[PDB]
Write an enzyme that holds these catalytic residues in place. Structure first.
Site, PDB file in Angstrom:
ATOM      1  N   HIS A  35      10.555   5.035  13.610  1.00  0.00           N
ATOM      2  CA  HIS A  35       9.501   5.414  14.589  1.00  0.00           C
ATOM      3  C   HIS A  35       8.614   4.181  14.917  1.00  0.00           C
ATOM      4  CE1 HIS A  35      11.002   9.463  13.606  1.00  0.00           C
ATOM      5  NE2 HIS A  35      10.910   9.077  12.316  1.00  0.00           N
ATOM      6  N   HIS A  49       0.477  -0.104  11.395  1.00  0.00           N
ATOM      7  CA  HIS A  49       1.654  -0.170  12.291  1.00  0.00           C
ATOM      8  C   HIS A  49       1.130  -0.242  13.716  1.00  0.00           C
ATOM      9  CE1 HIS A  49       0.463   3.959  11.895  1.00  0.00           C
ATOM     10  NE2 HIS A  49       0.638   3.918  13.222  1.00  0.00           N
ATOM     11  N   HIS A  55       1.939   1.026  18.003  1.00  0.00           N
ATOM     12  CA  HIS A  55       2.614   1.745  19.097  1.00  0.00           C
ATOM     13  C   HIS A  55       2.686   0.827  20.299  1.00  0.00           C
ATOM     14  CE1 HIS A  55       2.145   5.589  16.811  1.00  0.00           C
ATOM     15  NE2 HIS A  55       1.020   4.935  16.349  1.00  0.00           N
ATOM     16  N   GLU A 101      -1.841   4.683  22.599  1.00  0.00           N
ATOM     17  CA  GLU A 101      -1.941   6.145  22.419  1.00  0.00           C
ATOM     18  C   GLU A 101      -3.251   6.616  23.021  1.00  0.00           C
ATOM     19  OE1 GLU A 101      -0.722   7.135  18.225  1.00  0.00           O
ATOM     20  OE2 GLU A 101       1.216   7.520  19.373  1.00  0.00           O
ATOM     21  N   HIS A 115      -2.811   0.668  14.412  1.00  0.00           N
ATOM     22  CA  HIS A 115      -3.441   1.678  13.561  1.00  0.00           C
ATOM     23  C   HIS A 115      -3.456   1.196  12.129  1.00  0.00           C
ATOM     24  CE1 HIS A 115      -2.350   5.001  16.629  1.00  0.00           C
ATOM     25  NE2 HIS A 115      -3.450   4.330  16.926  1.00  0.00           N
ATOM     26  N   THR A 148      -0.821  11.149  14.879  1.00  0.00           N
ATOM     27  CA  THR A 148      -0.188  11.146  16.219  1.00  0.00           C
ATOM     28  C   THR A 148       1.320  11.234  16.087  1.00  0.00           C
ATOM     29  OG1 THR A 148      -0.121   8.767  16.379  1.00  0.00           O
ATOM     30  CG2 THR A 148      -2.171   9.907  17.181  1.00  0.00           C
ATOM     31  N   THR A 149       1.857  11.409  14.877  1.00  0.00           N
ATOM     32  CA  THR A 149       3.293  11.703  14.660  1.00  0.00           C
ATOM     33  C   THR A 149       3.349  12.936  13.793  1.00  0.00           C
ATOM     34  OG1 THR A 149       3.318  10.226  12.851  1.00  0.00           O
ATOM     35  CG2 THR A 149       4.067   9.328  14.999  1.00  0.00           C
TER      36      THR A 149
HETATM   37 ZN   LIG Z   1      -0.092   5.191  14.692  1.00  0.00          ZN
END
Ligand SMILES: [Zn+2]
Ligand SMILES: CCOC(=O)Cc1nn[nH]n1
Length: 258
Positions: free
Chosen positions: A62, A92, A94, A104, A117, A196-197
């Site tokens: 992911h 990590h 996005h 995000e 994040h 958010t996952t």
């Molecule tokens: Zn994140």
């Protein structure tokens, strides 16, 4: 048929396995700069990363996670909207297929090229697994990336990505200093939200920095060479691993700054 970011398993599908996807405090959200109110009672944020111990970098299929030693209080986030002490467990990003999307959170509907994040857990709950079951369990520091001048303190991350191309690959990642990823200013927005996952748990105090960092086209291009797939499987580029903005519902976004 596991969750992901494709046409058949992406954010619009997640509610089927994780009904809290349509919950009351989902993330990310649009930050309306004309609606978020200065709160004079927010303390300044305390980011204490000098004793931070990075261990490993992992392609989890992911994103890639830089993981820290969180067995004692080494790298912590305190103050701002937080009560108590939140330990850094991993960071990590996005990111987008192109520079016009990838964040995000959005700011007055503006999408950044990427979002960092830094995930921290509340040490009054003893372990990360117990913290995520609590409304005040996690504190995530969100930092927007825009494309321009290279970020020097990101290059050690960029140069190991070759080595973790596919899902499940990891590499030693000792002695990385996350202070190299911060902007000058710690001016922030805060609101209560979620992961958010999946599993999308409503356990997060969000702290989103107003000042983005600059990274180079060449740095984000290397994020986009990563693979969602495992080794020797059909190549699916790791791009557009962002969930879009969710309804704000009964929530106020507070600003640290006039
Ligand atoms: Zn994140
Ligand atoms: O922690 C966070 O980064 C929020 C999030 N949940 N999954 N990816 N991001």
């Amino acid at each position: 048929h596991h969750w992901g970011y494709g046409k058949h398993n992406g954010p619009e599908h997640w509610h089927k396995d994780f009904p809290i996807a349509k919950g009351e405090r989902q993330s990310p959200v649009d930050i309306d700069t004309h609606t978020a109110k200065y709160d004079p009672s927010l303390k300044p944020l305390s980011v204490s990363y000098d004793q931070a111990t990075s261990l490993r970098i992992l392609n989890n299929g992911h994103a890639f996670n830089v993981e820290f030693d969180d067995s004692q209080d080494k790298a912590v986030l305190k103050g701002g909207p937080l009560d108590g002490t939140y330990r850094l467990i991993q960071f990590h990003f996005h990111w987008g297929s192109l520079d016009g999307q990838g964040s995000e959170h959005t700011v007055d509907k503006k999408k950044y090229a990427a979002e960092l994040h830094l995930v921290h857990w509340n040490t009054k709950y003893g372990d990360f697994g117990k913290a995520v079951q609590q409304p005040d369990g996690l504190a995530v520091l969100g930092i927007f990336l825009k494309v321009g001048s290279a970020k020097p303190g990101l290059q050690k991350v960029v140069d190991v990505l070759d080595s973790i191309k596919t899902k499940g690959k990891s590499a030693d990642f000792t002695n990385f200093d996350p202070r190299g990823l911060l902007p000058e200013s710690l001016d922030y927005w805060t609101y209560p939200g979620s992961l958010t996952t999946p599993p999308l748990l409503e356990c997060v105090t969000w702290i989103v920095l107003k000042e983005p960092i600059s990274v180079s086209s060449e740095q984000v291009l290397k994020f986009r060479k990563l693979n969602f797939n495992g080794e020797g499987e059909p190549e699916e580029l790791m791009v557009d691993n962002w969930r879009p903005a969710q309804p704000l519902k009964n929530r106020q976004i507070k600003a640290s700054f006039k």
